[PDB]
Design an enzyme around this catalytic site. Structure first.
Site, short mmCIF file in Angstrom:
data_model
loop_
_atom_site.label_atom_id
_atom_site.label_comp_id
_atom_site.label_asym_id
_atom_site.label_seq_id
_atom_site.Cartn_x
_atom_site.Cartn_y
_atom_site.Cartn_z
N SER A 1 8.19 10.84 -25.45
CA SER A 1 7.84 9.48 -25.06
C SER A 1 7.22 9.43 -23.67
O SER A 1 6.36 8.58 -23.41
CB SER A 1 9.08 8.60 -25.17
OG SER A 1 9.50 8.52 -26.52
N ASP B 1 8.67 19.06 -34.34
CA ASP B 1 10.10 18.87 -34.63
C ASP B 1 10.32 18.74 -36.14
O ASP B 1 10.00 17.70 -36.72
CB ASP B 1 10.63 17.62 -33.93
CG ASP B 1 10.89 17.83 -32.46
OD1 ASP B 1 11.56 18.82 -32.10
OD2 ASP B 1 10.43 16.99 -31.66
N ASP C 1 14.42 20.70 -23.81
CA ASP C 1 14.02 19.55 -24.61
C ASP C 1 15.11 18.49 -24.61
O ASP C 1 16.25 18.77 -24.99
CB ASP C 1 13.69 19.98 -26.05
CG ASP C 1 13.26 18.82 -26.92
OD1 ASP C 1 12.93 17.74 -26.38
OD2 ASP C 1 13.22 19.00 -28.16
N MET D 1 18.74 22.52 -25.64
CA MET D 1 18.75 21.10 -25.94
C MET D 1 19.58 20.36 -24.90
O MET D 1 20.79 20.60 -24.78
CB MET D 1 19.30 20.82 -27.34
CG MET D 1 18.48 21.37 -28.48
SD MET D 1 16.79 20.76 -28.54
CE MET D 1 17.08 18.99 -28.53
N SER E 1 6.03 16.96 -27.70
CA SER E 1 6.49 16.90 -29.07
C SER E 1 5.84 15.72 -29.78
O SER E 1 5.89 14.59 -29.28
CB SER E 1 8.02 16.83 -29.13
OG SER E 1 8.51 15.64 -28.56
N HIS F 1 4.30 20.78 -29.71
CA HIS F 1 5.68 20.92 -30.17
C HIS F 1 5.91 20.11 -31.44
O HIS F 1 5.57 18.92 -31.51
CB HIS F 1 6.64 20.49 -29.06
CG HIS F 1 8.07 20.82 -29.35
ND1 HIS F 1 8.60 22.07 -29.17
CD2 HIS F 1 9.08 20.05 -29.84
CE1 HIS F 1 9.88 22.07 -29.51
NE2 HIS F 1 10.19 20.85 -29.93
N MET G 1 15.07 22.20 -37.08
CA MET G 1 16.40 21.61 -37.27
C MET G 1 16.69 21.46 -38.75
O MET G 1 16.78 20.36 -39.28
CB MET G 1 16.50 20.27 -36.55
CG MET G 1 16.75 20.39 -35.07
SD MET G 1 16.06 18.99 -34.20
CE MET G 1 14.31 19.34 -34.39
N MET H 1 12.88 18.38 -39.24
CA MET H 1 14.24 17.95 -39.58
C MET H 1 14.34 17.74 -41.08
O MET H 1 13.48 17.09 -41.67
CB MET H 1 14.59 16.66 -38.84
CG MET H 1 14.42 16.73 -37.35
SD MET H 1 14.86 15.17 -36.60
CE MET H 1 14.28 15.40 -34.92
ZN LIG Z 1 12.29 20.18 -30.63
#
Ligand SMILES: [Zn+2]
Ligand SMILES: [Zn+2]
Ligand SMILES: [Zn+2]
Ligand SMILES: [Zn+2]
Ligand SMILES: [Zn+2]
Ligand SMILES: [Zn+2]
Lengths: 223, 227, 221, 222, 223, 220
Positions: free
Chosen positions: E200, E38, E177, E141, E11, E36, E72, E40
């Site tokens: 990370s 993400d 994830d 998740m 990600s 990936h 998200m 939001m």
């Molecule tokens: Zn994700």
């Protein structure tokens, strides 16, 4: 006063929705000019009325008169598209109901419709300053929409609105809706209104033609 | 024929496809042609991306003389306030989606205390688990075979019809199993065989040239539905 | 495997002009838990009392556990205030939080005991993956914020008691809505061990007799 | 053309464990109006007290006018409850109601006095067409629901007093937020006649001396 | 177990947004399978990340690897259209975030994309029953999205998820994830996951390839 | 007024090579890095969040970063952009239920605060926050949806008058269809801070466009 020709716009909320085409034909045959369309989405006001399909059905039935769609909905942009395709003539909305008023007014104009802003009893006219070129009609509510007694302070707002339009040089209609009857339509026009919404006063009367004839008679000895 | 705990078959035309310029006339023709229930699709431009008709139209049909049961499907959110208006307007059934009410039980009770029959509507993806603790308060279960407010029958609905039919059969309660979305003459037999006893059709009836012939054809397939 | 019986009067029926006094009296009459009904005029159609009232009771001397039931949405911000206000339990509805696990974790990290409240129609399924984070399960036997005990709640009580027993964890089973002396026995027999009563206690002339009467029915279990 | 001075302590700073006692003391110490700050956790990031607490004050014996400031949105439903709960004033923010006139009309039709509350940044223009329906105008000198008097409020007070003076109607001009003895004279000279203080009164050791001090400064104002 | 070939989907929230193209190239050249993404919107979660333009920017730069967009956000339909035109490969969203899950899944499929449903730690798997033919990926998740330690119960939900996929006969990826590292990737995979999102653990390592090789090494000592 | 400043909008930049592209636009003479933040709610688009501002600071960008918030509500993300190293933070008054507290949140963080005005939004709300705005941004297009709305010049002159009569140091920023052919007239209307997006970042040479703009700014 750089006004526009008087127009009577019955709101079909008072019409017979089991015989809508017939009822609209009758009020138009009685001399009415504009079919007023009150759209409520159960959120901006605590009531739900009729959607674009009813405007479509009236057009498919033969009604060629101007259809004036007053949007008491929020947000407005998506359903504006549907009323353009459904054949609306005017599309008006409340400035409070759109996060981007200019883009919403432009959306109507780019659809070929005439666009307008509706003002609740408490709403001041300041928002018109920077959209004067994009409004074709201004509707002042003399009652709280969606909830029946004429608010007297509207006459002052009618006069202020008539002054603002006259100084713009643009052809903008001044519309009024809420408690409009024969006994006060003379005074209402003198304040500066040129477009008149009546509902119960016409559709619940035993004779539509006499009421409209009575209204135009009072409108002549008004100005 | 079968051992299901069903209710007598009922055809519920959706007046979304009717002539809103001659609505009273159009409803009379479909009722005189053998339809049982007037189906009322109420959309508030928020729960679904469309706005249809409110309680005043239900009132107009009652003031016009329509005495058939009127089935109000609420595609609105929230539901409680407008539930009252449809009770006062003369609705017979009022159904709503479980996602659209913060308090499903109170909403169902509101309908019942009006004298109406109450129901829960299920989107194609909504599972039936929420029925477990309201079985005593639902008179009808509406399964959507299309996404409401947007057009092809979703085949997985037949499996959910069978699942719903089983829950009603084992419950001991009198609950109608309704289906809406792409129901036509060519599939009404399979739909009924899956367990539905209440059938909403829209274009198939109101867009047809002869209302009575279509309804007879539907009943022809409904008769051969439990072999 | 249950937890010791607890009577948790809801201060909605108490005297808010003499609140510290009324809470002292109901506690001295044998009540175990002070139940705190928080309504935000959005999740339910009513507005009741916020964290300053929990704070006021703590500054007044009330050391009893204060059980804060959140009928609000969203929940995360006001959870923080009730942690600082001295709440003991904080419970909320799963529908009112977009992230149930984070919200339950938020309560635990403040040092409070956490719970999930289930509306009459809410199934118990959402407990499957948060059993380790709930200290209490509250079943509503009426529609919150709107008044007669819904009989189907007893079936859900037995299903809830079974899930808690199979978890091995110490989780209270609480009930709220129309709980009285005439029905507390069956409610407890269904599997409830924590009982919220409001009108039945605070509107009675003598608090001690009612609570003593309730435990008598809890004894005949 | 002002109205008689009125001191309206805010009970957010009162002892909610002994609320009836605490209100009796501030009223016995010379307070005029019980100010009621209602927050719904949505319009402001806080939740305070609802209509049952107003009812509890009436059922306890408090006959003084109870001034309910609604920091809530939407407002109409809870307005009805506060009418039945025995409120005297009910005020709300114009931004919090989609239909301000109907909401004001709702309060008046219950027998209560109605008002509009203006955040520090909110302009006064919206009063033009509701002058006949407002009995009180509340200017926030702090951001509601979040503690220092915003100096620009004095200018808005003078503008508001002029609008009320030019209307010919009996409308109270209320101020709330960081009002203390050291600034109440200047606030009154700006045109306020109804004064909300919270901590300055309820956190003081003797309510009567603080209230007495306020009236002393109110005299050396105009 | 009717699984899919193992795939590592780093990600890019943990990537260097000042040198994003370089960093994506390195992580793919280091053996990553899927990029990936993400997304939001500051409402569904308390954070705002990156929109479709960044998906476009990676495609205009040359990234041909499959781009997995985790939404998200709420509502989802409008931004689904933009991520289709921006070149996404997977688009997944939370069922709580859409009022009409089936129509939203169909929207992704009709754009030519692969569709998925994302499950918060507490969200039950029940909603998959009637959309199994329309999900290409299921994302579990193991932390609360938008807020860092693997929630242990997720392994049980993975086994429940893998069993549902195994019984369907459909080609559906099982994605995980939240706090995924080399020390637990073996246990996670044995529980039934076949698509692994790490952030990370990879992008903050000094050598991306060594971590990916180590992860691929642990995946061998799995089943 | 304030000294003229050119604030390219990084919506038109290369998000695959952002640090390089921002370095290039700054080396070509740009003054402010303009940051358009959209949350898919206040406007129908979602752009970039605080992590990107943070990424630019960790990369070495020391230039002023001007964060325009097209989001609603605003307070929480204001906190994030303060931590990320923003220089200006501006928001729409309609997007905040409590405008004063939101402006104050920015000022208390050490950033400069501003209010953004949609084409239809009147300037009336500035009356009681003149001491708390460091910049006033006038949108000449509908944000989030591309042609300069002509009435904006009238609002620019009206706004410039309000700032001139206040005695306070407030920048007058303009955004929407700003190009070399119209930047002179816009500055003549009273703007001193100019947001351009495509006109700079889509050009083949950043320095020539910025040099061309400053030439037109001189004849104002
Ligand atoms: Zn994700
Ligand atoms: Zn109208
Ligand atoms: Zn239907
Ligand atoms: Zn409770
Ligand atoms: Zn107040
Ligand atoms: Zn901008």
């Amino acid at each position: 006063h750089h006004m526009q020709p008087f127009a009577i716009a019955p709101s079909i909320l008072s019409a017979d929705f089991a015989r809508l085409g017939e009822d609209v034909d009758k009020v138009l045959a009685a001399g009415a000019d504009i079919v007023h369309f009150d759209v409520m989405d159960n959120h901006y006001v605590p009531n739900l009325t009729i959607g674009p399909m009813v405007c479509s059905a009236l057009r498919k039935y033969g009604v060629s008169a101007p259809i004036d769609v007053h949007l008491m909905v929020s947000p407005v942009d998506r359903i504006i598209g549907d009323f353009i395709e459904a054949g609306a003539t005017y599309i008006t909305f409340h400035p409070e109901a759109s996060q981007h008023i200019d883009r919403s007014l432009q959306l109507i104009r780019d659809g070929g419709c005439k666009a307008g802003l509706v003002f609740n009893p408490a709403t001041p006219l300041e928002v018109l300053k920077y959209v004067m070129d994009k409004v074709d009609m201004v509707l002042l509510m003399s009652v709280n929409p969606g909830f029946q007694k004429f608010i007297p302070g509207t006459l002052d707002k009618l006069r202020e609105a008539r002054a603002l339009i006259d100084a713009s040089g643009r052809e903008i209609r001044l519309e009024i809706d809420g408690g409009v009857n024969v006994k006060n339509i003379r005074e209402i026009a003198a304040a500066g209104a040129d477009t008149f919404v009546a509902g119960s006063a016409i559709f619940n009367a035993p004779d539509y033609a006499e009421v409209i004839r009575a209204m135009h008679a009072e409108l002549a000895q008004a100005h």
